[PDB]
From a paper:
In total, 22 antibody fragment (Fab)-antigen complex structures were solved at 1.54- to 2.95-Å resolution to gain insights into whether differences in potency are associated with different features of PfCSP repeat recognition.
Comparison of the 1210- and MGG4-like binding modes revealed that the N-core conformation was largely dictated by the HCDR3. All seven 1210-like mAbs contained a bulky Lys or Tyr residue six positions from the end of the HCDR3 (termed here position HCDR3(-6)) that directly occluded the MGG4-like conformation through steric hindrance. In contrast, the MGG4-like mAbs used IGHJ4∗02 or IGHJ5∗02, shorter gene segments that do not encode an HCDR3(-6) residue, and did not contain this steric occlusion, either due to having a small aa in this position (i.e., H-Ser100I in Ky15.11) or because the overall orientation of the HCDR3 was angled away from the N-terminal end of the peptide (as is the case for Ky15.1 and Ky311). In fact, when a Ser-to-Lys mutation was introduced at position HCDR3(-6) in Ky15.11 (Ky15.11-S100IK), the MGG4-like mAb was converted to a 1210-like binder, as shown by X-ray structure determination of the mutated Fab in complex with the KQPA peptide. In addition to the change in binding conformation, we also noted a register shift in the peptide as Ky15.11-S100IK bound the KQPA peptide with DPNA in the N-core like all other 1210-like mAbs crystallized with the KQPA peptide (Ky15.2, Ky15.8, and Ky15.10), whereas the wild-type Ky15.11 mAb positioned this motif in the C-core like the other MGG4-like mAbs. The inset highlights the salt bridge (orange dashed line) between mutated H-Lys100I and peptide Asp9. In particular, we demonstrate that the MGG4-like conformation induced by Ky15.11 was enabled by a small Ser in position HCDR3(-6).
Residue numbers in the entry:
A (entry chain A): 1 to 52, 52A, 53 to 82, 82A, 82B, 82C, 83 to 100, 100A, ...
B (entry chain B): 1 to 94, 96 to 213
C (entry chain O): 9 to 15
The structure:
Amino acid sequence: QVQLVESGGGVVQPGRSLRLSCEASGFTFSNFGMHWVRQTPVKGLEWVAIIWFDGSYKYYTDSVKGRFTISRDNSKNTLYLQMNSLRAEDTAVYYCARARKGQRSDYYGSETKYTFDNWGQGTLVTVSSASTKGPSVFPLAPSSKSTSGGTAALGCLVKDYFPEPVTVSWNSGALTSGVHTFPAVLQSSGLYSLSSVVTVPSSSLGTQTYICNVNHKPSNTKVDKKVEPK
Amino acid sequence: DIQMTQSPSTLSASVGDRVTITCRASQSINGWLAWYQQKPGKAPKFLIYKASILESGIPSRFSGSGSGTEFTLTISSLQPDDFATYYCQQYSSYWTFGQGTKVEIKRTVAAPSVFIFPPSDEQLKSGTASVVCLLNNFYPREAKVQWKVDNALQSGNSQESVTEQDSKDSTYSLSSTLTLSKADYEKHKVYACEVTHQGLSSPVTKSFNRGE
Amino acid sequence: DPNANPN
């Protein structure tokens, strides 16, 4: 199927350089135009740039002109966004999208406008002068004080990481029902902390294995933690 | 540029209710209006193009219409998984979005499942002690959490975080964490978490003693 | 034209 994957996000010192890479699979990357979109927490969704299928033409939004450069390597199925002279306004989640005809494929008219679909998950760029700190994963073990009814709650505590974000899966993605990954909180030290919990059958606490998988891509931290009853 | 304006910014409605969102354009964009849906933790999803053409695989309960500069997204029967923020985009002159409209879901009152977690030995060996209190699947979102260490109401040492509304049971979860030093944690015995909610007949107290 | 066929 069509899958776009972004990479390259983290901290950048205000007024520095960063490159993003969008990998493409499931279609002919050299046949479609590509977009870079970003979402800011307050100002919302904002188009950034578009590149043609062959890289012949490139158009940018005004705020990024003279600072960003969209490019592509059709032999590698990889889209690029070279972000230079980064500002505070550039802190956002950057998606890459594939060009899409804003009308059914059979349609043929004078004015046929195009948009973008097939958005990837995104890569979060945080513009800050602070240092990257990896997370610390601790187990929220189930106990009699975590059991109500036939249900037992467990989880893992991820604290003291910067920048955002961390992704937390359970049993390598095979456990999704009952999972509650909470939004991160800003600790008094400027570092982030979150907790991901999951409710499971209490009777299966001895025959089942629950491992919390934490991924902090900015610090290249991959932690796998087993939560056992005590 | 072309400015898109959505209304309202937040909408509450029950399951099986008809929901309509309006989208204004600063000028005539012909029929080049697209609707995106962003569910929590996921990227926006292509829903409608040409203001009315649903994307392949979009449920039949979604629909769209437009009259030159004003466009609407309509859900005939609102569903739990329809909880999201919906954006309208014009692709006539460049690509610009609206501020979005979050369609929250009104359900019945649900009492929280309260769980408490003593700090871990791995964390305690590092110098801190985080006591975690969990409020699982409750409605409404408003909830009261108080920390009581040896029956002493704590202040200035806890942090909270609520999850977005669930896409299945349309409930909320809350994470209250009481952070202490290993010293202060060993200067007491009883660590409690008292919860107050509409669906709780009386306040529910979950507690543990240091060293159980 | 930015909104024409880029493919």
